[PDB]
């Protein structure tokens, strides 16, 4: 066989220990899920420094906590805008997930609160910026470098999927790099807790699984497809399926054909062919052996999964950090005021926040 007695017993024990870890993690999650924390700070506890990120959601600002001096990333949502964009449920869900999960590669919600006009999620400040920027600058990541990040996503999805959370928003734009070079996952608006199938068309064209494009009911295997896209893009510098317009991208995604740079190792191509598998009955992460087909793949043979989880692996890349509050790994945005009305807006909608 492929393993002698010692290696087989070690692997089996390791896989059993994962089960035990996840069983405890689920119990911890469900307690916080069922009784969420609320209203753990207020706006005047913080000085607003600089906008780090923007979007239809609102903005994320670097803030400094006045008492402690600690920096945080404060996501600010306009309650009236959220309502108008039909994002009430997504916004409530994002905060509910964030305050309930606990994993070393998931960003921590340190405080949350609301006022008459806005919702505030105060997260730890992840100073290295988006993987996207580093990827586009460096061009592509070496396979060891890509693997180090991929291993963190594998473990994070193993954790999330055990909680019946589908993530659905994986892409380099949505992965931040912390001061030790490890990943932080931040955005959970598209995540959904469902045991079975779900049907919403959501995500980013290059990262959509075929069963999403084809308007099928789908399950957590769409996250393993997206992992294949991410690994490919990290190692190539461009994604496996691209075109001028999304419709052309979808045609390629559903076609069942993918092509690889000549510098991809055979192990990497084999992994990617099994993650970027249009046939759900054959896709790694969706088989009887579950996540083990991925973790035990040859491309991950050098990965010490426990050492990754414990953050004892030396990262291949440490972003520049000229001290706390440093924002040099983020873009510059036009700074708007934070208006708080004398009149509460959309109160009932956001009771649970």
């Amino acid at each position: 066989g492929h393993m002698g007695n010692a290696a087989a017993a070690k692997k089996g024990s390791e896989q059993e220990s994962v089960k035990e870890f996840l069983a405890k993690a689920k119990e911890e999650f469900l307690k916080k899920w069922e009784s969420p924390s609320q209203n753990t700070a207020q706006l005047d506890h913080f000085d607003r420094i600089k906008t780090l990120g923007t979007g239809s959601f609102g903005r994320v600002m670097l803030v400094k906590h006045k008492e402690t001096g600690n920096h945080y990333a404060m996501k600010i949502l306009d309650k009236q805008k959220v309502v108008k964009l039909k994002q009430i449920e997504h916004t409530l869900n994002e905060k509910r997930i964030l305050q309930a999960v606990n994993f070393p590669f998931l960003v921590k919600l340190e405080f949350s609160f609301k006022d008459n006009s806005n919702l505030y999620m105060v997260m730890e400040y992840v100073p290295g910026g988006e993987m996207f920027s580093h990827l586009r600058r460096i061009g592509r990541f070496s396979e060891p470098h890509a693997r180090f990040y991929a291993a963190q996503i594998v473990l994070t999805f193993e954790y999330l999927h055990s909680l019946d959370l589908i993530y659905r928003d994986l892409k380099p734009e949505n992965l931040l790099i912390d001061q030790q070079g490890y990943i932080q996952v931040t955005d959970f608006g598209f995540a959904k807790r469902v045991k079975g199938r779900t049907w919403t068309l959501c995500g980013t064209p290059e990262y959509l699984a075929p069963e999403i494009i084809l308007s099928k009911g789908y399950n957590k295997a769409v996250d393993w497809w997206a992992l294949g896209v991410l690994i490919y893009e990290m190692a190539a510098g461009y994604p496996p399926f691209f075109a001028d317009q999304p419709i052309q991208i979808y045609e390629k995604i559903v076609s069942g054909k993918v092509r690889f740079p000549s510098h991809f190792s055979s192990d990497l191509k084999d992994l990617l062919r099994n993650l970027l598998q249009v046939d759900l009955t054959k896709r790694f992460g969706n088989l009887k052996n579950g996540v083990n087909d991925i973790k035990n793949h040859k491309w991950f043979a050098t990965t010490d999964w426990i050492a990754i989880y414990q953050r004892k692996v030396e990262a291949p890349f440490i972003p520049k950090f000229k001290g706390p509050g440093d924002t040099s790994n983020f873009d510059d945005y036009e700074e708007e005021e934070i208006r708080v009305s004398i009149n509460e807006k959309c109160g009932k909608e956001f009771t649970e926040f």
Partner: peptide, 20 residues
């Protein structure tokens, strides 16, 4: 080349989700 095709796609920048 594939790289050139990627540059030509116009989709080298940050990509929005479908709902945006």
């Amino acid at each position: 080349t594939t790289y050139a095709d990627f540059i030509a796609s116009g989709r080298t920048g940050r990509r929005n989700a479908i709902h945006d």
